[PDB]
Paper text:
TTR is a homotetrameric plasma protein that carries L-thyroxine (T4)8 and vitamin A910. The TTR molecule is composed of four identical 127 amino acid subunits, named A, B, C and D. Each monomer consists of eight strands in a β-pleated sheet conformation. The weaker dimer-dimer interface defines two, largely unoccupied, funnel-shaped T4-binding sites. Pathogenic mutations affect the native TTR stability, facilitating the dissociation of the tetramer into monomers that, upon partial unfolding, aggregate into amyloid fibrils.
The modelled TTR [name] variant was predicted to be more stable than A108V by FoldX, with a ΔΔG of 13.71 kcal.mol−1 relative to TTR WT. We engineered a novel TTR [name] variant to attain an optimal packing of the hydrophobic residues in the T4-binding cavity, as confirmed in the crystal structure. The stabilization promoted by the [name] mutation is even more dramatic, since this variant begins to unfold only above 8 M urea and its tetrameric structure seems to be essentially intact even at 9 M of the chaotropic agent. In addition to the formation of these novel interactions, it is remarkable the reduction of the hydrophobic cavity that binds T4 and other hydrophobic compounds, which is partially occupied in our TTR variants by the aliphatic side chains of Val108 or Ile108, leading to formation of a much closer AC/BD interface in the tetrameric assembly. These different interfaces in the TTR variants result in the decrease of the distance between the methyl groups of Cδ1 of Leu17Symm with Cβ2 of Ala108 (at 7.80 Å distance), with Cγ2 of Val108 (at 4.25 Å distance), and with Cδ1 of Ile108 (at 3.58 Å distance).
Residue numbers in the entry:
A (entry chain A), B (entry chain B), C (entry chain A), D (entry chain B): 10 to 125
Amino acid sequence: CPLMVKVLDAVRGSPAINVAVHVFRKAADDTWEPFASGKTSESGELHGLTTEEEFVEGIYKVEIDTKSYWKALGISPFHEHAEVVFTANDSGPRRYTIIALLSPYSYSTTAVVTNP
Amino acid sequence: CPLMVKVLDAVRGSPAINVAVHVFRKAADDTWEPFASGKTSESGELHGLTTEEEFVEGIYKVEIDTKSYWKALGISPFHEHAEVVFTANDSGPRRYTIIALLSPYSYSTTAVVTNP
Amino acid sequence: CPLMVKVLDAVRGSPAINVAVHVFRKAADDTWEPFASGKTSESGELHGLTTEEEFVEGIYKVEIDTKSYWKALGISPFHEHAEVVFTANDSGPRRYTIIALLSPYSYSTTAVVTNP
Amino acid sequence: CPLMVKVLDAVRGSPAINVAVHVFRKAADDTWEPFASGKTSESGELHGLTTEEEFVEGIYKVEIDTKSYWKALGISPFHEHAEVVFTANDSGPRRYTIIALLSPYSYSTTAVVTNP
């Protein structure tokens, strides 16, 4: 599983459940092509977005729909979404975990990149 | 000054100087129309992007060129850039300060919103 | 496993391996009594600090020796250590994960608290 | 002003006003000797804790009373407080700004260190 997204709610100290996540990949013509999507589970994780074979080198964008998460809790948050844009697999295949820590007016994003 | 951006370097413990910042407004056809830009000063701040008159309600994107900053320091970074997207002035004009705390494989973006 | 500590290096985008962690509990006389200790594994996690039965209500302090981690990498970091002080189990037993994200001049700490 | 503390509220998007801050210096017997204190202003800042003459080399602890702040807002917090511990002036006198970004179950502390 080479791309995993984990989303945590820093207000409640809990996984952020049912958060929509959309992944895009930059094409040769420079547009953003839809690549995969999903929602976070009860553990705040989203697995199974892609496979080692499909996840070739390229520039990827992960957009996490944090506004709908907060709005469902009654909150009008600052960000429309939490983004992550990155070059993947430049020196060969790696496994990427994207960790997003969410608050209504702040978000932090961290990548843990490992080599199997 | 309705929009200010402050960028800090968590590796060196310093303002992040000469970071390029580009601001866009979402156009009616959902494309991003570039609005303003500048580079952070010696205190890591960027002032004067826009004015109260021009900064009408809408959705804005602030792109911070973090990859160029880390490259200039000789440090391998994860992200292409950091993209803060937010709806402005939804309840009246506000002053926004966006604080970006940078590390090579992690960053956080926080908004401090005050009502003049 | 009711107390778990996970430590990540935000510079390299990796688990922070072999980081010493000391846990203390406030006694009735208000001193800090040593409670458990350990080091993070290859995954940056430290499991097995305590048991559900031993981990009674109280105020706990987790001190993560981040200075030795950075010094071994050649870096003189800002913090002497990363602390976490918290009341545990006030409304009954819970499971606590403490996530520390480390940079030489910044650290973030987040608690994920769940109810089995 | 060799030591300043700035505290921000990630839930409301604002300076964290009237937060108590206590500074200690480690004594020769390893006890913490309280040094100075104050509360953050309307801009979330606390200036004037110490002076260049008094702020000699040593190990300092800054305790930020985050639990009282969250209680005053009616929000359940995780931590008892946030404790930033650092060695000061090891390579000569520096000006330190400690920035604390607060959420109820997460916080980060960053130092901006500049040489006058």
